[model samples]
Structure formats: structure tokens, C-alpha cells
Target: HHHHMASLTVPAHVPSAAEDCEQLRSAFKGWGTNEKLIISILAHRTAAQRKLIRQTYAETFGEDLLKELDRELTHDFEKLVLVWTLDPSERDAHLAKEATKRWTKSNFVLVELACTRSPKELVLAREAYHARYKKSLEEDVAYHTTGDHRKLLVPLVSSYRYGGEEVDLRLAKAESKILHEKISDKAYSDDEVIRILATRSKAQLNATLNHYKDEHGEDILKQLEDGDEFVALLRATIKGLVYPEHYFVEVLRDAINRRGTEEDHLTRVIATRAEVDLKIIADEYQKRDSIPLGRAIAKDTRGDYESMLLALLGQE
Candidate 1:
């Protein structure tokens, strides 16, 4: 049996939307749309709290949550905070990476990914990232770091208890069935949902996905998909685990390597990941190849996007 209670400290977010709206308005009143305070609020709101905040902000401000943020702040900080505001785990992951980058001794990114994220959410996030990014999140990490340190930290970043490979298949399949049945049969139980997602392995997960696809004949990810709101949160987890050098290089490669549109892929990844882990990525890039990752990326990749990414990567 699962217990249901609000994980949030603040009460009745929707009900108190008016009061919260007033508070936000007042806070911004003196600053005349002060960007920092707005960022502080968005970056700090918890998952459940953010849902309410988004709702309240939209209702009060008459604009989308992120768009409002876009209007309010300027530069990379704005982009980072906007991304952070998108999900709970993502926000924590971004925050963790930032904290880790600042200190430079421990892989705090792993700390955030392992400690704060539930095993299930980590599983989902990892899968979700692959679906969007078209590559394994670990592959990105592996490319960035090396030696015993990379081995120790990278494996720990997974929320899975498995060998940290293999998607939990059986349970994801069964749970997918349960979800279908619940909606179809109106026999849904939260426990069933929890049971299904919380269990399974990569092989098992693949099997389950195959089975689920046979049953539904629609892509299982669409059914299992957590939506963009959830997706953005998962992306934050990727940001935490990612290293900047490879990411920047990939972006640079992406921008200039117009043999195909691969540059676009590289560009988006760099622009997105650079906000959190650039410095460490730079360190790793230099340590591994005796050249700055940005320099390598800039050298390898050639194009307009490359220039922008290079500027970001090379800038202090």
C-alpha cells in the first residue's frame, strides 16, 4: 500500500494562487521586474510546487511560465533558470552540477543524480534523454571523463541498482499493461503504477516494451512518455551528469559538419549542456588530450553555430 500525502511544504497552491500572485507581484514591484529574484523563485520551486507555481503564474500573469521567464531575465542565467523551472529532478540536477562545478573536488553531479532522484525517475529520465537526444546519456559522460575517477563516478550516477546498464523491462511492460487496463478498465491503482515502473531491468524493459507495443500497436514511449513538462525535468538530470568538452565539441562538430545536419544535434547539446558543466569539461578535455575541449570542438567543427558555441565555450 502506498501512502498519499503532499510532499510540498506550501499548502493549497491552486487555492492560494491569488495570494501567491500578490506576493510575487509585490516582490517584483520595487525591482521593476528584477531578473534575479524571478530566477530565484523559478529555480527553487519544488516539483509539486512548480506545477502550482506554473499554474498560478500563468493565471496571474496571463503568459506561459517559461515565456514569462524569458521576458524577465537576460543571457545564459535566464536560459538555465528557465530550463530548471521545467521539472523537479532537472532543477535539482542542474543545481547539483552547478554546486559541484563550483567546488571541483567531488562529482557532485553524481551525488545529485543518485541521492535526490528516485530510482524510477532516473530510469525514466535516462530513457527519455535518449529518445530526445538520440544517444545514451552515459555515452556523453564517458566521452567527457576518463580513468578510475570516471569509472567510479559515472556508474554511481544511475538511479538503477542493476549493473547500471539494461533498462528494467518486465516491470515497465507489466506496469504499462496495468496503466492501460486501469484507464481502459477503470481499475487503476497508484500502487500498481508504482509497482510497474519501480521494478524491471533493461532486457526486461525491452521485452516489456515489445510486448506492450504488440498489445497497443502504438509506440510504448508515447504511452509511457512523461510529456515535455516531465521531459525537461529529465533533461536537467542529463545536464548534471554531462561534461562540457565533449558536449561543446559535439556541438562544434554539429554546427560545421554539414555533410549532414549533424551539426544541429551537436549545437543543441553544447548550448544546453554548457550552462552547467563547462569548466569541468574543459579540465577533462585538457587532461585527456592536452587541448581544451572547446578548442578541439572549434577546430573540428566549422560553421556559424560553431562560432557561437566556440564563443560560449572559450569565454571566461
Candidate 2:
């Protein structure tokens, strides 16, 4: 389903791993990999806090956390988040509320921290919503709801599933196919679809998606026509776009880093950043991936597509 998942390049160094010790263990998946924790904790933790966590991780685990991270994870927009933004909860409350208030044509779904953070962290967004907005992040999206999107997110913003990277292959098989079919027909809000989505843990969800891809021969996203804002938002939800330049970095990273390379975002990356932060991002990209951003994007036929990225690199 995703031979295209090859968006990562192991750098000159081992990449980062999960945030906390337990989360680190799960991403290690009993013995596996995860980038979310890297950004969530390593990046989110204060440098001082990270050093503390760093010490504890070894005092706690006997391995250098940073050194081991390079062992699993391997990045673009994701990196920006890596070096881009630090704080979570209280800060997220604002962007989420903005989505509810009719800020742009912007359709920021409950995809906010919906499936992204730890179950407890979900509470932070919800509590922070009230702490700041004095409202429930649940009702915030609940107010202007997309039918299935509503069914899924309302309960989602209000609920929390298993926090670790655990998955139930049994349920993954049983509750699985329906989602593939539901999405296949473009049925957004079927209870079956909502229930599966709302209940499945992120690791389980991604695994089910992997199965969905294996069985159906298309990533869950392939069903959408590129996708509605909801489609992008959900994709954004599972693992993406929470910070700014960092957010763009993830999407733009996906745009170019994926096997075939996604055009939708490459254009967005060049045009969007060309004006504001090319040189900085250019540098950050290097720091994050150990390669020159523009130099890596070469091609004759790859992009008229290629022009904007290369052209923008010239801007630096």
C-alpha cells in the first residue's frame, strides 16, 4: 500500500525516539520505531528538561536516548516540529479554538490533538480549551460539525484510547475491512466508520491502515480524491502539521520525501516559504536531514514542480 512510505533517510546520526521512557518502549514497539515521541518529548521537552529526561532515560534504561533514537526514526516537516515548536497543551488550545471560530476557509477538524497526543495530553487540550477558551474542545468542534466527521471527532475530542503503541491484530482484522469499504464508497459518517476510528488506538489504527493498504492496495487516503479538507485534516491528525514552519516541513517533507513525491505540497512549500523563511528553513532542513534542501530536489521531468523548489533555493 505504501512502497511510497520511503520518505525517510537515516541521517549521519541516529534519529530521535519516543518522548518519555514508557512511550519510548512502545515505539520500540516491544521493539520498534516511532517519530511522534521524538517531537512530542525530545523536541517538546525543554533543553534543560530534555537533559533531565536524558539522564533519567539512561539512569532509567542504561542507553543514551538520543543515540538510540537514531536507531529507529529516520524526516522533513516532522523535523521542523523536531526543532520548530516546543510547547503543547495550552498553546494548542488557541489554534483549535481558532478552527471553531470561522477563521479562514480553514477547516481544522478535531484532528487538533485528537489522535496525536497521549490520552492524558488529550485532556490538556480539552482542559486548556476551558482554561483559556472556557469551553470544551469537544463542543468547540461539536458546534460546527461534519456529520461523520462530527460523529467521529465529538466523541474523539472527548475520549482517550490506549496510550501506548500497542495494537490488537485480532480487532485489526475484525473491525478493519469495514473502514476500508466505508471509505471506499466515500461514506464519511457511518457509525461503523466512526466507531472504528474513534476506538482504534493510533498504533492499532496505523496497523489497520497498513492492513487496509495490504488488502485493498491503496493507502486509506487513496480513497479520497486527493482529499477534502477533512481528508487532509485526518492525515494531519494521525501524524502531522501541528507547528508552523515545522508544520510545513512535515507536509512539504511528505510532499517530496515520499517515493513518488507529492506535488500538492511541494508547490505549497516553495510558494509559501519562498517569501518568508527560505534561508532559515534551508538551513534547518540541512540540520534536520544532513543534506542540502535544494540540491536534493533535482530533476528535469520531476517538476515544473521542480522549478519552484529549485528556484526558491536560488532565492537563498
Choose the strongest candidate by TM-score.
Answer: 2
Error of 2 at 167 (Å): 2.0
Per-residue lDDT of model 2, residues 143-176, tens digit only:
8766646766687777777767877887787666
Q: Note the residue pairs that clash in candidate 2.
A: 14-70, 15-69, 15-70, 26-29, 28-31, 28-32, 77-249, 77-250, 148-189, 303-306
Measured on C-alpha atoms, candidate 2 has an lDDT of 0.55
Error of 1 at 276 (Å): 23
Cα-based TM-score, every candidate: 0.35, 0.51
Worst 10 residues of 2 by lDDT: 1-10
Q: How accurate is candidate 1 locally (lDDT)?
A: 0.46
Off by over 4 Å in 2: 1-87, 232-316
